[PDB]
Design a protein around this ligand. Structure first.
Ligand code: DTP
Ligand code: CA
Ligand code: CA
Ligand code: CA
Ligand code: CA
Ligand code: CA
Ligand code: CA
Ligand code: CA
Length: 901
DNA sequence: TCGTATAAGCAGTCCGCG
DNA sequence: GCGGACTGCTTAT
């Protein structure tokens, strides 16, 4: 096999590299890597190294890395550019792995771990580590085993061994239902004392040293706790055995308001799954507890136990260990689904970076562009200091708030990256500027042509047309990878719909799901077989189709994230290629393109309908337009259509055969006007929306910018078995809105779009009547809680105190003196409830940590004093009134003359 | 919330608005 | 009570 790195570190003048050798063996080497850096040199001198602008460079080879660093400093003191890759370990990887890396994941040791710590006096601070570690479950991907380290004897209780037999049993037999598929994979090691537990853990760690280290909150909790606990018990040198090169750093993470400490373990790549989830999942969650996320991702039941977690070990050690094991498995189950580790390895090896650098697109892109340029003996510029400066972004059209019955939307593919490619926007392709007319003049094609030589953006920038810049070249590669995976995702989605249809008529028979690749559109043969399957097989196939879709989603959406972040990096001061001229060139062209095509689509439709000045485009945001199709439907007449799918097909065909060609012509003209290198403004039909044929549904509505709902029949070539609500921006989509309220509002919107006003009034009346029965958690609002101390004046609300922060202050007073009560963590989320006048809490709201039941001593009081009226008016009625007035509908039946009978 | 970007919505405080 | 000025938070893109 081809060799690949696992981890790389710089330690003084040595590179420490763990890698897989040609035989598949894990090795470690120390290399006295001599880095090269570059300086500009005279034109006369003959060399093979040039900077990105074609200026000649001389290579300076340093006796060691510290010399290179010292040189960079002296170059700053002199006031001269020190060119080249200043992160020497990236240069080492580039030198050592000068080919496309092909990695074998089966050879990479992925460790998933979780620890337990009993604590009476509240949260066990990792930096203190004052309490014993009494359980560690460590899953190893190479052995495929859960190693369980169990403390039998503690100052907080002596306990009996965990029993694998009870662990396996159903909860109905008094067991813990540890999943039967892992029971055989558990290696249980009980211990008489904490020191031997920890010593053995370290010896184990040494034998099976993680390359990738993950888990849930491992970076913020488990790793620092284990490290500091071993430190406190044995000394630093022993704690540093967690690093394979015996080097660690206490790393301070700085944010806006305060800071925390993590431990950097050299020669390990820590990918904390919470952090992976937050970056790559594209969710915003009310809580980030593992139970909550597991429930959301996997539909698994919450881990059940009585009493505080501080008493679970001594009261039920059996359950204590089993839940520790299960918590580790849950992260693996989430990864089997979401596949973020796979993604991180793909991105990391592609860029030739430390795998943990996938969190940073700036680092990812710096390394991709460096390797790309190195290939041509080109030399990257030095990073520079820049002041943070605002710059303009996308255009968003102000919609007329209204119902909109028939809507067809159109969307530009991967817009910002396409702009970069079309215009040829790169640090080294800048050709100069041209005198800019107001944007409106370009949109209406009355402005003078910017250039007859260069490719232009309406911000005034001109770019070379002779060759592609390194940014277009490298963004195109990842764009093309994204395209492949999105193709797989949509095929899986279309395949899902095929299964949902067949599920309407399941066969009464025993059979097995078809062995198929859901990444490809089902053939005719597969379609026939599906029509003959049982519901049990169809459901398993639907589950599998949907897992394939999710896998594709991860792969495609995060490649899209990476390429859109390359645009965003052009507007970040820490990026090597930071240039506000390039960032603005991109955003300004985007603005032009959307308004240009709006004008075009309007002109085209006014023509085919034989009108003038009619607004067919009702809305647009950044890269997408929404076309009112009412007139198109009316031109054939609703009565001519057999069913919903009939007009959906007709619109599909109108969009494909008539509008897209007009849209294409309009963008090709704009490409010529701007003299761009390559036409890449590809705008395709996205959504087809409208009410069910023969219903009183309104189809869709907008309330304002970034706030709308559509009843969608077809999305990007996926014809739904059942219409799908596409709701953007409205309270149903906000994590701050109560769960039960999101669900109720969503159903109000469903009724509006699919059934009409009367149906809506039916549902509202019932919800209003019954809502006081809803679980308090389901009707709690959610908010992040920043700067709690700032607004805390002697335990009371300071000036301008935010409503949710007031809740927390109320809560804090209610749990005063109690170090066992859950504390609200700064920067984390809270549930928030209003409180009726004259409650014992002494204020108008209370807040407690999200994902949790509120502590038992105040629960009854909260439940008794909860202000249901305020709750209803704020989270439900106000948003609903917003929706309905926008749509010219009433949620309550207005009195009429018929009330006389 | 360490980790690419801007546009823009709504809740809530504070206080004006004769 | 509603709006603007502003903070806080959260979406859409
Ligand atoms: N997370 C982000 N970071 C930076 N820029 C973004 C981000 N999301 C969107 N944008 C900008 C760049 C995008 O090209 C543009 C429109 O985005 P969006 O409608 O999500 O899809 P897209 O056109 O980028 O890809 P596609 O439509 O192919 O899925 O807005
Ligand atoms: Ca736990
Ligand atoms: Ca699209
Ligand atoms: Ca798009
Ligand atoms: Ca059938
Ligand atoms: Ca879009
Ligand atoms: Ca097309
Ligand atoms: Ca009480």
């Amino acid at each position: 096999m081809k060799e690949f790195y696992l981890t790389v570190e710089q330690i003084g003048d040595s590179i420490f590299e763990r890698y897989i050798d040609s035989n598949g063996r894990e090795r470690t080497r120390e290399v006295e890597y001599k880095p090269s850096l570059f300086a500009h040199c005279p034109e006369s001198q003959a060399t093979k190294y040039f900077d990105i602008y074609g200026k000649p460079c001389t290579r300076k080879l340093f006796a060691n890395m510290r010399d290179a660093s010292q040189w960079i400093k002296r170059m700053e003191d002199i006031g001269l550019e020190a060119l080249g890759m200043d992160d020497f370990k990236l240069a080492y990887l580039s030198d050592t792995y000068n080919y496309e890396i092909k990695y074998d994941h089966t050879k990479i040791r992925v460790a998933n771990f979780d620890i337990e710590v009993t604590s009476p006096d509240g949260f066990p601070e990792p930096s203190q580590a004052k309490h014993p570690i009494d359980a560690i479950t460590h899953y190893d991907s190479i052995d495929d085993r859960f190693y369980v380290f169990d403390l039998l004897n503690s100052p907080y209780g002596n306990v009996e061994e965990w029993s694998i037999e009870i662990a396996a049993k159903l909860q109905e037999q008094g067991g813990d239902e540890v999943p039967s598929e892992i029971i055989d994979k558990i290696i249980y090691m009980p211990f008489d004392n904490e020191k031997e537990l920890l010593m053995e853990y370290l010896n184990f760690w040494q034998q099976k040293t993680p390359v990738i280290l993950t888990g849930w909150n491992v970076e913020s909790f488990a790793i620092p706790y284990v490290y500091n606990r071993i430190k406190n018990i044995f000394g630093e040198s022993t704690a540093k055995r967690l690093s394979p090169h015996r080097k660690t750093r206490v790393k301070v993470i700085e944010n806006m308001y305060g800071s925390r400490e993590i431990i950097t373990l050299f020669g390990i790549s820590v990918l904390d799954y919470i952090d992976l989830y937050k970056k790559f999942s594209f969710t915003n969650q009310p809580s980030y507890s593992l139970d909550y996320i597991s429930e959301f991702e996997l539909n698994v039941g919450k881990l059940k136990y009585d009493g505080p977690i501080s008493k679970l070990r001594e009261s039920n050690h059996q359950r204590y260990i089993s839940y520790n094991i299960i918590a580790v498995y849950r992260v693996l189950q989430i990864d089997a689904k979401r596949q973020f580790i796979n993604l991180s390895l793909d991105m990391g090896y592609y860029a030739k970076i430390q795998i943990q650098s996938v969190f940073s697109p700036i680092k990812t892109w710096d390394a991709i562009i460096f390797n790309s340029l190195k290939e041509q003996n080109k030399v990257i510029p030095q990073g520079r200091s820049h002041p943070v400066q605002p710059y303009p972004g996308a255009f968003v059209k102000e919609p007329i708030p209204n119902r909109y019955k028939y809507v067809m939307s159109f969307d530009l593919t991967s817009l910002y990256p396409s702009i970069i490619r079309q215009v040829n926007i790169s640090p080294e392709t800048i050709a100069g500027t041209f005198k800019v007319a107001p944007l409106h003049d370009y949109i209406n094609a009355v402005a003078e042509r910017p250039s007859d030589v260069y490719s232009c953006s309406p911000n005034g920038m001109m770019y070379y047309k002779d060759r592609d810049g390194v940014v277009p070249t490298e963004i195109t590669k990842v764009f093309n990878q994204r395209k492949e995976h999105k193709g797989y995702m949509l095929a899986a989605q279309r395949n899902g719909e095929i299964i949902k249809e067949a599920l309407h008529n399941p066969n009464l028979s025993v059979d097995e799901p078809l062995d198929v690749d859901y990444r490809f559109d089902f053939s005719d043969e597969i379609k026939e077989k599906i029509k003959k399957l049982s519901a049990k097989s169809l459901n398993e196939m639907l589950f599998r189709a949907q897992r394939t879709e999710v896998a594709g989603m991860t792969a495609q959406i995060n490649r899209k994230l990476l390429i859109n972040s390359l645009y965003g990096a052009l507007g970040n001061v820490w990026f090597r290629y930071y240039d506000l001229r390039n960032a603005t060139a991109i955003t300004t062209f985007g603005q032009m393109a959307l308004q240009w095509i709006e004008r075009k689509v309007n002109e085209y439709l006014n023509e085919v309908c034989g009108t003038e000045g009619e607004a067919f485009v009702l809305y647009g945001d950044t890269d997408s337009i929404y076309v009112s199709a009412d007139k198109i439907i009316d031109k054939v007449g609703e009565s001519k259509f057999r069913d919903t799918n009939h007009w959906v097909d007709f619109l599909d065909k109108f969009a494909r055969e008539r509008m897209e060609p007009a849209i294409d012509r309009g963008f090709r003209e704009m490409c010529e006007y701007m003299n761009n290198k390559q036409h890449l403004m590809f705008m395709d039909r996205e959504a087809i929306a409208g009410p069910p044929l023969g219903s009183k549904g309104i189809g869709g509505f907008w309330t304002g910018k970034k706030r709308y709902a559509l009843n969608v029949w077809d999305m990007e070539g996926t014809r739904y078995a059942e219409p799908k609500l596409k709701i953007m921006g409205l309270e149903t989509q906000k994590s701050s809105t109560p769960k039960a309220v999101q669900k109720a509002l969503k159903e109000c919107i469903r009724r509006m779009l699919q059934e009409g006003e009367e149906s809506l009034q039916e549902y509202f009346k019932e919800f209003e009547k019954e809502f006081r029965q809803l679980n308090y958690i389901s009707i709690a609002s959610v908010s992040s809680a920043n700067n709690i101390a700032k607004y805390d004046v002697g335990g009371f609300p300071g000036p301008k105190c935010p409503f949710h922060i007031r809740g927390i202050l109320t809560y804090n007073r209610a749990i005063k003196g109690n170090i066992d009560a859950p504390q609200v963590v700064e920067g984390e989320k809270v549930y928030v409830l209003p409180l009726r006048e004259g409650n014992p809490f002494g204020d108008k709201c209370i807040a407690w940590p999200s994902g949790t039941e509120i502590t038992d001593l105040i629960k009854d009081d909260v439940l008794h004093w909860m202000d249901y009226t305020v709750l209803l008016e704020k989270t439900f009625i106000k948003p609903l009134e917003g929706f309905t007035s926008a749509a010219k509908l009433d949620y309550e039946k207005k009195a009429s003359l018929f009330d006389m009978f």
